[PDB]
Amino acid sequence: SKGEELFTGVVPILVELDGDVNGHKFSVSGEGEGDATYGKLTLKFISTTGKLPVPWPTLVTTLVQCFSRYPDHMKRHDFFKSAMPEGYVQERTISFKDDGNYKTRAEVKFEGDTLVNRIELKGIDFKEDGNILGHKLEYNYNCRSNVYITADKQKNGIKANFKTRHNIEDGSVQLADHYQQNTPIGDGPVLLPDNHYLSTCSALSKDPNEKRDHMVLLEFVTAAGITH
Ligand SMILES: [Mg+2]
Ligand SMILES: [Mg+2]
Known part of the structure; x- marks a missing residue:
């Protein structure tokens, strides 16, 4: 695709999220860069308004799959880059x-040379002393996640499903089932993929000199499930 050519080098990234979970309002700003040649993302997020009412690890999947490494033989299946620079809408439950x-x-799109992810998040029906509002999740992440992708021809887009598992401080796990839909913003042709998945591994850390509430993310993502 034409859009694939925008990702051959290192691209700056900005992320902006506005959130409301059970009436608790919060906002997150992120900066970093992506290098799709290596499926590599480095991002630092800061919580900028009200006290974060949910654990950082539960926001990782919401806070730019256009930076996935698609192997050369799978390039015709990369919807995400093909929608650029005009971008795509990404929705999840x-x-x-x-x-x-x-x-x-x-909405994920280019603003000049910079790849931007603007998000609205709404959370409802959370339990007061559950694992989420109770902040009972460890600050870490389990690898790897498989993001299963299929075409949605009717909306000229894709759908995806996957499970992530967050470690609870007592040694148990909190399951998060994800259902995802992406549709192009622009009027250019986009690639509608054969079934495949993204193999993803995230690692969370803290900046020792940062006193604001924050998350540092290093993430590697590679498309798989189709043989050459
Ligand atoms: Mg700012
Ligand atoms: Mg109700």
Whole structure:
């Protein structure tokens, strides 16, 4: 695709999220860069308004799959880059087992040379002393996640499903079921993929000199499931 050519080098990234979970309002700003040649993302996020009412790890999937490494033989299946620079809408429902749900709507597009992810997140039906509002999740991430992608010809886009599992401080796990839909913003042709998945590994850390509430993310993502 034409859009693929925008990703051959390192690209700056900005992320801006506005959130409301059970009436608790918050905002997150992120900066970093992506290098799709290596499927590599480095991002630092800061919580900028009200006290973060949910654990950082539960926001990782919401806070730019255009930076996935698609192997050369799978390039014709990369919807995400093909929609650029005009971008795509990405919507999810994230269902936390035995707890509430996030509904997210994001637009991912270029603003000049910079790849931007603007997100609205709404969370409802969370339990007061559940794992999420109770802040009972460890600050870490389990690898790898498989993001299963299929074409949605009717909306000229894609759908995806996947499960993530967040470690609870007692040694148990909190399941998050994700359902995802992406549709192009522009009028150029986009690539409609054969079934495949993104193999993703995230690692969370803290900046020792940062006193604001924050998250540092290093992430590697590679498309797979189709043989050459
Ligand atoms: Mg700012
Ligand atoms: Mg109600």
